[PDB]
Tab-separated table of N, CA, C and O and ligand atoms in Angstrom:
chain	number	residue	atom	x	y	z
A	1	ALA	N	1.049	-1.408	0.005
A	1	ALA	CA	-0.562	-0.250	0.399
A	1	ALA	C	1.099	1.019	-0.084
A	1	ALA	O	1.312	0.866	0.981
A	2	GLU	N	0.608	2.423	-0.361
A	2	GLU	CA	1.374	3.163	-0.533
A	2	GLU	C	0.100	4.827	0.183
A	2	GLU	O	-0.924	4.705	0.114
A	3	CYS	N	0.699	4.648	1.363
A	3	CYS	CA	0.574	5.408	2.682
A	3	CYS	C	1.236	6.977	2.797
A	3	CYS	O	1.129	7.291	3.761
A	4	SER	N	1.196	8.109	1.326
A	4	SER	CA	2.228	9.121	1.110
A	4	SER	C	1.541	9.816	0.076
A	4	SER	O	1.477	9.093	-0.592
A	5	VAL	N	1.393	10.314	-0.437
A	5	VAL	CA	1.771	10.894	-1.429
A	5	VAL	C	2.056	13.262	-1.710
A	5	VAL	O	1.626	13.324	-0.426
A	6	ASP	N	2.460	13.026	-2.515
A	6	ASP	CA	3.214	14.042	-3.312
A	6	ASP	C	2.021	15.721	-3.344
A	6	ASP	O	1.926	14.947	-4.370
A	7	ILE	N	1.408	15.912	-2.861
A	7	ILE	CA	1.150	17.511	-3.841
A	7	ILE	C	0.955	18.672	-3.883
A	7	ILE	O	1.910	19.442	-3.634
A	8	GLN	N	1.318	19.152	-4.820
A	8	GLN	CA	1.469	20.263	-5.101
A	8	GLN	C	1.136	21.464	-5.388
A	8	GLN	O	-0.797	21.778	-6.029
A	9	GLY	N	1.120	22.944	-4.853
A	9	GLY	CA	-0.058	24.520	-4.758
A	9	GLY	C	0.676	25.105	-5.630
A	9	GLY	O	1.520	25.767	-4.870
A	10	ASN	N	0.167	25.948	-7.309
A	10	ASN	CA	0.902	26.208	-7.263
A	10	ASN	C	0.099	28.150	-7.588
A	10	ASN	O	-0.856	28.008	-6.304
A	11	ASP	N	0.936	28.528	-7.953
A	11	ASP	CA	0.221	30.341	-8.930
A	11	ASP	C	-0.476	30.518	-9.499
A	11	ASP	O	-1.640	31.395	-9.406
A	12	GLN	N	-1.514	29.109	-9.624
A	12	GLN	CA	-2.808	29.045	-11.342
A	12	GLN	C	-3.659	29.070	-9.867
A	12	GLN	O	-4.953	28.799	-9.829
A	13	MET	N	-3.909	28.356	-8.254
A	13	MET	CA	-4.619	28.466	-7.928
A	13	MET	C	-5.016	26.839	-8.166
A	13	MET	O	-6.931	26.651	-7.820
A	14	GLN	N	-4.756	26.272	-7.905
A	14	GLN	CA	-4.490	24.222	-8.314
A	14	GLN	C	-3.497	23.455	-7.366
A	14	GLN	O	-2.346	23.548	-7.570
A	15	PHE	N	-4.862	22.703	-6.886
A	15	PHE	CA	-3.669	20.880	-6.253
A	15	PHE	C	-3.753	20.504	-7.658
A	15	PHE	O	-4.151	20.862	-8.988
A	16	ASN	N	-2.251	19.638	-7.864
A	16	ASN	CA	-2.471	18.491	-8.569
A	16	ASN	C	-3.085	17.643	-8.781
A	16	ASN	O	-2.403	16.649	-8.949
A	17	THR	N	-3.873	16.963	-8.714
A	17	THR	CA	-4.331	15.968	-8.030
A	17	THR	C	-6.330	16.324	-7.807
A	17	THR	O	-5.950	17.466	-7.121
A	18	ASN	N	-7.263	15.862	-7.965
A	18	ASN	CA	-8.522	15.659	-7.754
A	18	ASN	C	-8.959	14.359	-6.585
A	18	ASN	O	-9.604	15.062	-6.355
A	19	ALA	N	-7.847	14.018	-6.451
A	19	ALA	CA	-8.181	12.542	-5.751
A	19	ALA	C	-7.930	12.155	-4.566
A	19	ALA	O	-6.932	11.642	-6.316
A	20	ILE	N	-7.431	11.800	-3.420
A	20	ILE	CA	-6.802	10.869	-2.965
A	20	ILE	C	-6.991	9.470	-2.984
A	20	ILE	O	-7.904	9.439	-2.129
A	21	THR	N	-6.041	7.692	-2.430
A	21	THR	CA	-6.724	7.674	-1.993
A	21	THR	C	-6.778	6.796	-1.027
A	21	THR	O	-5.128	6.739	-1.421
A	22	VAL	N	-6.921	6.431	-0.010
A	22	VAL	CA	-6.273	6.462	1.460
A	22	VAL	C	-6.172	4.447	1.946
A	22	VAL	O	-7.325	4.182	2.236
A	23	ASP	N	-6.022	3.758	1.229
A	23	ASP	CA	-6.104	2.358	1.509
A	23	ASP	C	-5.777	1.564	2.913
A	23	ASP	O	-5.078	2.486	4.390
A	24	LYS	N	-7.108	1.361	2.884
A	24	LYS	CA	-7.708	0.849	4.848
A	24	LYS	C	-5.928	-0.433	5.324
A	24	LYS	O	-6.516	-0.104	6.319
A	25	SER	N	-5.465	-0.395	4.501
A	25	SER	CA	-3.926	-1.303	5.091
A	25	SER	C	-3.118	-0.189	5.565
A	25	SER	O	-2.381	-1.082	6.626
A	26	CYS	N	-3.427	1.064	5.399
A	26	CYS	CA	-1.728	1.923	6.185
A	26	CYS	C	-2.485	2.466	7.686
A	26	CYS	O	-3.792	2.596	7.489
A	27	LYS	N	-1.842	2.069	8.509
A	27	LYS	CA	-1.905	2.709	10.019
A	27	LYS	C	-1.730	4.667	9.908
A	27	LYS	O	-2.830	4.974	10.506
A	28	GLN	N	-1.094	5.021	8.684
A	28	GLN	CA	-0.954	6.229	9.079
A	28	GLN	C	-0.230	6.637	7.339
A	28	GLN	O	-0.510	5.714	6.615
A	29	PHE	N	-1.429	7.974	7.423
A	29	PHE	CA	-0.837	8.470	5.547
A	29	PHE	C	-0.126	9.802	5.807
A	29	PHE	O	-0.718	10.909	7.071
A	30	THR	N	0.541	10.388	4.974
A	30	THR	CA	0.847	10.981	4.965
A	30	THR	C	0.900	12.025	4.098
A	30	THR	O	1.047	11.550	3.117
A	31	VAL	N	1.153	12.939	4.107
A	31	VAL	CA	0.465	14.564	2.669
A	31	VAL	C	1.473	15.151	2.687
A	31	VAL	O	1.822	15.885	3.831
A	32	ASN	N	2.871	15.422	1.348
A	32	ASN	CA	3.429	16.363	1.852
A	32	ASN	C	3.647	17.462	0.539
A	32	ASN	O	3.367	17.249	-1.122
A	33	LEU	N	2.937	18.738	1.060
A	33	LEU	CA	2.402	19.582	0.314
A	33	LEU	C	3.708	20.631	-0.332
A	33	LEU	O	4.710	20.669	0.970
A	34	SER	N	3.921	21.054	-1.072
A	34	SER	CA	5.036	22.208	-2.204
A	34	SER	C	3.892	23.324	-2.210
A	34	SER	O	2.427	22.428	-3.104
A	35	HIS	N	5.529	24.141	-3.042
A	35	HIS	CA	4.576	25.272	-3.310
A	35	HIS	C	5.582	25.791	-4.850
A	35	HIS	O	6.108	26.504	-4.319
A	36	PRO	N	5.567	24.361	-5.159
A	36	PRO	CA	6.141	26.109	-7.107
A	36	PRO	C	6.000	26.841	-7.822
A	36	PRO	O	7.323	27.119	-8.639
A	37	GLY	N	5.491	27.561	-6.719
A	37	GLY	CA	4.723	29.192	-7.147
A	37	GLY	C	5.333	30.425	-7.682
A	37	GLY	O	6.749	29.701	-6.920
A	38	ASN	N	5.454	31.360	-7.409
A	38	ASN	CA	6.737	31.817	-7.356
A	38	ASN	C	5.572	32.915	-6.182
A	38	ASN	O	6.935	33.808	-5.556
A	39	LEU	N	4.021	33.217	-5.553
A	39	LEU	CA	4.171	34.035	-4.845
A	39	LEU	C	4.115	33.615	-3.325
A	39	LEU	O	4.114	32.246	-3.245
A	40	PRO	N	4.122	35.145	-2.469
A	40	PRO	CA	4.289	34.441	-1.042
A	40	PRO	C	2.762	34.075	-0.857
A	40	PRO	O	1.764	34.461	-1.496
A	41	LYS	N	3.001	33.813	0.681
A	41	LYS	CA	2.074	33.241	1.337
A	41	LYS	C	0.912	34.099	1.510
A	41	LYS	O	-0.543	33.834	1.734
A	42	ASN	N	0.698	35.051	0.910
A	42	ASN	CA	0.258	36.251	1.834
A	42	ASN	C	-0.898	36.945	0.497
A	42	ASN	O	-2.397	37.035	0.788
A	43	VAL	N	-0.650	36.265	-0.713
A	43	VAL	CA	-1.611	36.601	-2.479
A	43	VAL	C	-2.174	35.295	-2.790
A	43	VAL	O	-2.739	35.052	-2.936
A	44	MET	N	-0.852	34.479	-3.050
A	44	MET	CA	-1.457	32.917	-2.880
A	44	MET	C	-0.433	31.623	-2.175
A	44	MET	O	-0.444	30.551	-2.266
A	45	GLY	N	-0.825	31.848	-0.561
A	45	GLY	CA	-1.067	31.242	0.908
A	45	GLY	C	-1.197	29.772	0.129
A	45	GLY	O	-2.556	29.235	-0.434
A	46	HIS	N	-1.105	28.776	0.033
A	46	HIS	CA	-1.755	27.190	0.412
A	46	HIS	C	-2.099	26.277	1.680
A	46	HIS	O	-0.382	26.054	1.428
A	47	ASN	N	-2.799	25.644	1.892
A	47	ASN	CA	-3.379	24.750	3.031
A	47	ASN	C	-4.147	23.428	2.236
A	47	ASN	O	-4.353	23.644	1.770
A	48	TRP	N	-3.325	22.167	3.309
A	48	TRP	CA	-4.384	21.598	2.808
A	48	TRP	C	-4.447	20.242	3.732
A	48	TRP	O	-3.643	20.097	5.273
A	49	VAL	N	-5.576	21.515	3.681
A	49	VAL	CA	-6.965	20.395	4.948
A	49	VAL	C	-8.045	19.644	4.627
A	49	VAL	O	-7.968	20.110	3.409
A	50	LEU	N	-8.160	18.819	5.617
A	50	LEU	CA	-8.571	17.628	5.628
A	50	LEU	C	-10.031	17.644	7.171
A	50	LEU	O	-9.664	17.825	8.064
A	51	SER	N	-11.216	16.975	6.271
A	51	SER	CA	-12.214	17.062	6.435
A	51	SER	C	-13.529	16.567	6.279
A	51	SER	O	-13.049	16.154	4.833
A	52	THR	N	-14.731	15.858	6.357
A	52	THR	CA	-15.525	14.962	6.079
A	52	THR	C	-16.884	16.799	4.958
A	52	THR	O	-15.805	17.968	4.689
A	53	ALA	N	-16.901	15.722	3.804
A	53	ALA	CA	-17.389	16.695	3.064
A	53	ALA	C	-18.560	17.699	2.944
A	53	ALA	O	-18.376	18.223	2.319
A	54	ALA	N	-19.898	17.248	4.143
A	54	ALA	CA	-20.298	17.607	5.167
A	54	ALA	C	-19.672	18.423	6.193
A	54	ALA	O	-20.386	20.124	5.474
A	55	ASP	N	-18.362	19.150	6.416
A	55	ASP	CA	-17.735	20.237	6.820
A	55	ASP	C	-16.892	20.559	6.467
A	55	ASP	O	-16.911	21.478	7.431
A	56	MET	N	-17.157	20.370	5.366
A	56	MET	CA	-15.927	22.431	4.590
A	56	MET	C	-15.870	23.651	4.438
A	56	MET	O	-15.899	23.736	4.812
A	57	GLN	N	-17.762	23.288	4.056
A	57	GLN	CA	-18.250	25.507	3.819
A	57	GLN	C	-17.990	25.002	4.682
A	57	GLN	O	-17.615	26.396	5.043
A	58	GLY	N	-18.255	24.740	5.946
A	58	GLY	CA	-18.576	24.761	7.326
A	58	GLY	C	-17.020	25.378	7.530
A	58	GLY	O	-16.883	27.076	8.156
A	59	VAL	N	-15.805	24.538	7.957
A	59	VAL	CA	-13.509	25.093	7.357
A	59	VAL	C	-13.954	26.423	6.854
A	59	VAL	O	-13.079	27.201	6.912
A	60	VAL	N	-14.154	26.032	5.970
A	60	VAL	CA	-14.516	27.092	4.733
A	60	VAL	C	-14.619	28.334	5.190
A	60	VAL	O	-14.001	29.603	5.262
A	61	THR	N	-15.599	28.462	5.815
A	61	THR	CA	-16.162	29.831	6.529
A	61	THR	C	-15.434	30.171	7.224
A	61	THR	O	-15.339	32.156	7.171
A	62	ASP	N	-15.226	29.904	8.352
A	62	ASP	CA	-14.840	30.171	9.672
A	62	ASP	C	-13.152	30.364	9.310
A	62	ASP	O	-13.302	31.521	9.721
A	63	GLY	N	-12.758	29.443	8.632
A	63	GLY	CA	-10.854	29.497	8.371
A	63	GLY	C	-10.667	31.792	7.593
A	63	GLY	O	-9.705	31.358	7.795
A	64	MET	N	-11.922	31.623	6.048
A	64	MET	CA	-11.531	33.004	5.924
A	64	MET	C	-11.441	34.325	6.813
A	64	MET	O	-10.888	34.853	6.464
A	65	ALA	N	-12.171	34.439	7.550
A	65	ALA	CA	-12.195	34.749	8.709
A	65	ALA	C	-11.983	34.964	9.746
A	65	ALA	O	-11.298	36.232	10.632
A	66	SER	N	-10.818	33.465	10.113
A	66	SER	CA	-9.711	33.665	10.751
A	66	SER	C	-8.844	34.748	10.664
A	66	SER	O	-8.104	35.175	11.496
A	67	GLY	N	-7.725	35.120	9.337
A	67	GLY	CA	-6.849	36.052	9.057
A	67	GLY	C	-5.691	35.183	8.986
A	67	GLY	O	-5.893	33.930	8.982
A	68	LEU	N	-4.986	35.729	7.863
A	68	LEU	CA	-3.495	34.779	8.204
A	68	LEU	C	-2.589	34.504	8.856
A	68	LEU	O	-1.764	33.580	8.889
A	69	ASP	N	-2.598	35.486	9.942
A	69	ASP	CA	-1.568	35.096	10.790
A	69	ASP	C	-2.614	33.349	11.813
A	69	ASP	O	-1.790	33.408	12.788
A	70	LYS	N	-3.633	33.850	11.149
A	70	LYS	CA	-4.268	32.050	12.131
A	70	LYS	C	-4.676	30.711	10.719
A	70	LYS	O	-5.782	29.492	11.408
A	71	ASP	N	-3.804	31.082	10.190
A	71	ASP	CA	-3.046	30.451	9.180
A	71	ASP	C	-3.991	30.290	8.003
A	71	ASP	O	-4.784	29.106	7.450
A	72	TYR	N	-5.911	31.115	7.769
A	72	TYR	CA	-7.477	30.594	7.438
A	72	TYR	C	-8.368	29.649	7.510
A	72	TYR	O	-8.229	28.495	7.367
A	73	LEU	N	-7.602	29.016	9.306
A	73	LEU	CA	-8.291	27.794	10.119
A	73	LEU	C	-8.676	28.641	11.041
A	73	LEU	O	-8.923	29.402	11.788
A	74	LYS	N	-9.957	28.911	11.551
A	74	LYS	CA	-11.210	28.598	13.082
A	74	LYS	C	-9.968	28.191	13.707
A	74	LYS	O	-10.021	26.821	14.275
A	75	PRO	N	-9.700	28.315	14.986
A	75	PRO	CA	-9.008	27.642	15.876
A	75	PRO	C	-9.579	27.225	17.220
A	75	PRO	O	-10.237	26.688	17.421
A	76	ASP	N	-9.053	25.634	16.582
A	76	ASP	CA	-9.342	24.625	17.627
A	76	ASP	C	-10.507	23.984	17.103
A	76	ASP	O	-11.696	23.588	17.370
A	77	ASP	N	-10.525	24.298	15.588
A	77	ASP	CA	-11.895	24.046	14.724
A	77	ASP	C	-12.121	22.182	15.084
A	77	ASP	O	-10.912	21.772	14.509
A	78	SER	N	-12.217	21.824	15.680
A	78	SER	CA	-12.714	19.919	16.094
A	78	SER	C	-12.980	19.257	14.453
A	78	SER	O	-13.182	18.193	14.625
A	79	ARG	N	-13.609	19.991	13.608
A	79	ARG	CA	-14.034	19.767	12.399
A	79	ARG	C	-12.845	19.276	11.783
A	79	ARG	O	-13.246	18.669	10.275
A	80	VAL	N	-11.664	20.056	11.327
A	80	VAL	CA	-10.704	19.489	11.204
A	80	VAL	C	-9.986	18.083	12.028
A	80	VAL	O	-9.621	18.586	13.164
A	81	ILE	N	-10.115	17.454	9.829
A	81	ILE	CA	-9.260	15.930	10.767
A	81	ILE	C	-8.121	16.267	11.141
A	81	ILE	O	-7.273	15.225	11.557
A	82	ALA	N	-7.340	16.722	9.629
A	82	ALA	CA	-5.475	17.176	9.557
A	82	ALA	C	-4.917	18.267	9.045
A	82	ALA	O	-6.735	19.160	7.656
A	83	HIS	N	-4.051	18.450	9.544
A	83	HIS	CA	-4.412	19.434	8.535
A	83	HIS	C	-2.405	20.135	8.258
A	83	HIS	O	-1.849	19.748	9.097
A	84	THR	N	-1.941	20.697	7.287
A	84	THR	CA	-0.380	20.664	7.096
A	84	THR	C	-1.285	23.003	7.254
A	84	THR	O	-1.622	23.322	7.614
A	85	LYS	N	0.495	23.150	7.375
A	85	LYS	CA	0.556	24.920	7.107
A	85	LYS	C	0.548	25.940	5.894
A	85	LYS	O	0.297	24.920	5.252
A	86	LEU	N	0.321	26.901	6.266
A	86	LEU	CA	-0.278	27.449	5.536
A	86	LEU	C	1.096	28.086	4.636
A	86	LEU	O	1.939	28.758	5.254
A	87	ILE	N	1.810	27.391	3.701
A	87	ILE	CA	2.923	27.806	3.131
A	87	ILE	C	2.228	28.378	1.669
A	87	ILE	O	1.714	28.968	0.563
A	88	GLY	N	4.042	29.841	0.908
A	88	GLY	CA	4.446	30.140	0.179
A	88	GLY	C	5.109	29.764	-0.640
A	88	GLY	O	5.472	28.736	-0.536
A	89	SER	N	5.751	30.152	-1.266
A	89	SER	CA	6.819	30.170	-3.133
A	89	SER	C	7.525	29.847	-2.209
A	89	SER	O	8.678	30.144	-0.879
A	90	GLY	N	7.958	28.462	-2.563
A	90	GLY	CA	9.063	27.708	-2.197
A	90	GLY	C	9.459	27.203	-0.963
A	90	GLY	O	10.373	26.774	-0.734
A	91	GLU	N	8.504	26.595	0.195
A	91	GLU	CA	8.377	26.600	1.014
A	91	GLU	C	7.745	25.118	0.798
A	91	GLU	O	7.530	24.669	-0.543
A	92	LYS	N	8.015	24.071	1.970
A	92	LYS	CA	7.180	23.102	1.535
A	92	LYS	C	6.776	22.695	3.280
A	92	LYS	O	7.641	23.076	3.953
A	93	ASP	N	6.150	21.346	3.160
A	93	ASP	CA	4.565	21.450	4.650
A	93	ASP	C	5.026	19.651	5.106
A	93	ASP	O	3.417	19.411	3.251
A	94	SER	N	4.369	18.687	5.850
A	94	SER	CA	3.937	17.416	5.000
A	94	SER	C	3.627	17.505	6.769
A	94	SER	O	3.135	18.117	7.457
A	95	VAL	N	2.048	16.379	6.766
A	95	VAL	CA	1.360	15.870	7.639
A	95	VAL	C	0.952	14.845	7.410
A	95	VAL	O	0.607	14.427	7.492
A	96	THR	N	1.147	13.435	8.607
A	96	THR	CA	0.896	13.133	8.825
A	96	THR	C	-0.146	12.029	9.453
A	96	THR	O	-0.011	13.432	11.244
A	97	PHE	N	-1.288	11.548	9.936
A	97	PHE	CA	-2.217	10.835	10.873
A	97	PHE	C	-2.942	9.816	10.713
A	97	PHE	O	-2.399	8.990	9.622
A	98	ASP	N	-3.333	9.617	12.234
A	98	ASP	CA	-3.756	7.881	12.002
A	98	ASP	C	-5.512	7.451	10.799
A	98	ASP	O	-6.175	8.820	10.983
A	99	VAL	N	-4.936	6.898	10.305
A	99	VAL	CA	-6.297	6.309	9.185
A	99	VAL	C	-7.185	6.418	9.672
A	99	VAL	O	-8.804	6.343	9.412
A	100	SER	N	-6.705	5.460	10.980
A	100	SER	CA	-8.390	4.957	12.304
A	100	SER	C	-9.632	6.446	12.628
A	100	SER	O	-10.461	6.318	12.290
A	101	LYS	N	-8.427	7.892	11.494
A	101	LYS	CA	-9.398	8.923	12.301
A	101	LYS	C	-10.875	8.724	11.062
A	101	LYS	O	-11.194	10.043	10.914
A	102	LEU	N	-10.341	7.904	9.911
A	102	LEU	CA	-11.501	7.903	8.788
A	102	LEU	C	-11.984	6.607	8.773
A	102	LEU	O	-11.835	5.588	9.539
A	103	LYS	N	-13.843	6.613	7.774
A	103	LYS	CA	-14.390	6.000	8.062
A	103	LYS	C	-15.425	5.217	5.822
A	103	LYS	O	-14.594	6.347	5.694
A	104	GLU	N	-14.997	3.651	6.507
A	104	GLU	CA	-15.806	3.723	4.047
A	104	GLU	C	-16.375	4.152	4.720
A	104	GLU	O	-17.904	4.335	5.633
A	105	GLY	N	-17.549	4.678	3.302
A	105	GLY	CA	-18.674	4.955	2.976
A	105	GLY	C	-18.636	6.608	4.406
A	105	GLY	O	-20.456	6.367	3.844
A	106	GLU	N	-17.662	7.111	3.591
A	106	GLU	CA	-18.260	8.363	4.092
A	106	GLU	C	-17.175	9.526	3.395
A	106	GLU	O	-16.116	8.788	2.727
A	107	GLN	N	-17.967	9.887	2.645
A	107	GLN	CA	-16.848	11.173	2.501
A	107	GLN	C	-15.819	12.127	2.445
A	107	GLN	O	-16.162	13.129	3.307
A	108	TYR	N	-14.692	12.385	1.886
A	108	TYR	CA	-13.778	13.319	2.471
A	108	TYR	C	-13.945	14.677	1.581
A	108	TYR	O	-13.280	14.149	0.769
A	109	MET	N	-12.866	14.968	2.071
A	109	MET	CA	-12.632	16.093	1.266
A	109	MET	C	-11.858	16.808	1.514
A	109	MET	O	-11.969	17.030	3.152
A	110	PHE	N	-10.298	17.247	0.511
A	110	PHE	CA	-8.358	17.968	1.068
A	110	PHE	C	-9.122	19.852	0.062
A	110	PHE	O	-10.208	19.317	-0.910
A	111	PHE	N	-8.786	20.292	1.312
A	111	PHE	CA	-9.356	21.687	0.445
A	111	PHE	C	-8.175	22.594	0.416
A	111	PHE	O	-7.292	22.579	1.789
A	112	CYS	N	-8.260	23.901	-0.052
A	112	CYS	CA	-7.149	24.802	0.874
A	112	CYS	C	-7.851	25.960	1.791
A	112	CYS	O	-9.143	26.061	0.636
A	113	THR	N	-8.060	26.378	2.950
A	113	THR	CA	-8.627	27.464	3.166
A	113	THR	C	-8.502	29.243	2.920
A	113	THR	O	-9.070	29.409	3.208
A	114	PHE	N	-7.672	29.182	2.372
A	114	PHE	CA	-6.912	30.833	1.927
A	114	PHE	C	-7.950	31.409	1.230
A	114	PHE	O	-8.967	31.016	0.228
A	115	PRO	N	-8.409	32.234	1.217
A	115	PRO	CA	-9.746	33.032	0.722
A	115	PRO	C	-9.722	33.548	-0.771
A	115	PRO	O	-8.945	33.219	-1.635
A	116	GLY	N	-11.694	31.946	-1.041
A	116	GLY	CA	-11.367	31.896	-2.700
A	116	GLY	C	-10.771	31.271	-3.137
A	116	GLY	O	-11.017	30.291	-4.045
A	117	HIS	N	-9.678	30.518	-2.425
A	117	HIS	CA	-8.287	28.972	-3.752
A	117	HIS	C	-10.284	27.895	-3.427
A	117	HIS	O	-9.778	27.134	-3.495
A	118	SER	N	-10.528	27.556	-2.157
A	118	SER	CA	-11.195	26.230	-2.293
A	118	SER	C	-12.281	25.855	-2.980
A	118	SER	O	-13.059	25.528	-3.848
A	119	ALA	N	-12.288	27.324	-4.023
A	119	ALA	CA	-13.376	26.851	-5.923
A	119	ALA	C	-12.799	26.301	-6.519
A	119	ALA	O	-13.675	25.617	-7.727
A	120	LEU	N	-11.385	26.231	-6.513
A	120	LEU	CA	-10.657	25.188	-7.233
A	120	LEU	C	-9.043	24.147	-6.783
A	120	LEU	O	-9.367	22.720	-6.969
A	121	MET	N	-9.403	24.483	-5.578
A	121	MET	CA	-8.035	23.618	-4.151
A	121	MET	C	-9.296	23.148	-3.588
A	121	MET	O	-8.658	23.457	-2.640
A	122	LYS	N	-9.493	21.875	-4.077
A	122	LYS	CA	-10.866	20.598	-3.338
A	122	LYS	C	-10.481	19.625	-4.217
A	122	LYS	O	-10.493	19.485	-5.140
A	123	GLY	N	-10.366	18.706	-3.400
A	123	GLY	CA	-10.871	17.966	-3.494
A	123	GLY	C	-11.683	16.334	-2.703
A	123	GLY	O	-11.196	16.686	-1.584
A	124	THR	N	-11.401	14.824	-3.625
A	124	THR	CA	-12.643	14.195	-2.458
A	124	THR	C	-10.557	12.960	-2.491
A	124	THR	O	-9.531	13.754	-2.902
A	125	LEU	N	-11.050	13.251	-0.474
A	125	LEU	CA	-10.375	11.709	-0.036
A	125	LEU	C	-11.137	10.303	0.308
A	125	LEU	O	-12.379	10.540	0.773
A	126	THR	N	-11.318	9.233	-0.002
A	126	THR	CA	-11.922	7.949	0.448
A	126	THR	C	-11.051	6.287	1.223
A	126	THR	O	-9.722	6.675	0.269
A	127	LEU	N	-11.461	6.202	2.002
A	127	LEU	CA	-10.519	5.436	2.680
A	127	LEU	C	-10.993	4.178	1.565
A	127	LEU	O	-12.908	3.687	1.993
A	128	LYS	N	-10.554	2.969	1.287
A	128	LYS	CA	-11.138	1.469	0.364
A	128	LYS	C	-9.699	0.712	0.555
A	128	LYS	O	-8.654	1.150	0.544
B	201	LIG	CU1	-4.196	28.138	-1.461
């Protein structure tokens, strides 16, 4: 089983994957995010945030009102399962989480919470 995935967030406000499959055999799953763009995090910042499909809209909405200093995330938001930090050009960050935090038959969504980005920067994550 491949228990990790390398994802990129660029200046065109896009992730390089629209779907992630987490194999059931994995105990932990790792997401390695990088920013191959030229723009700084205050204008084109990207983070990889995971939540259930049902909680996405809430996380994104409250996230934007939180500000840059809060990584565009509502402090202690229980709806967030896992997340990388907000990164800009030339930066990278990884996040590892327990696969047991996920369940079969529930749709998950990964997305960037920087203002307006989730319009394009989002995708599905499923446990199979
Ligand atoms: Cu972004």
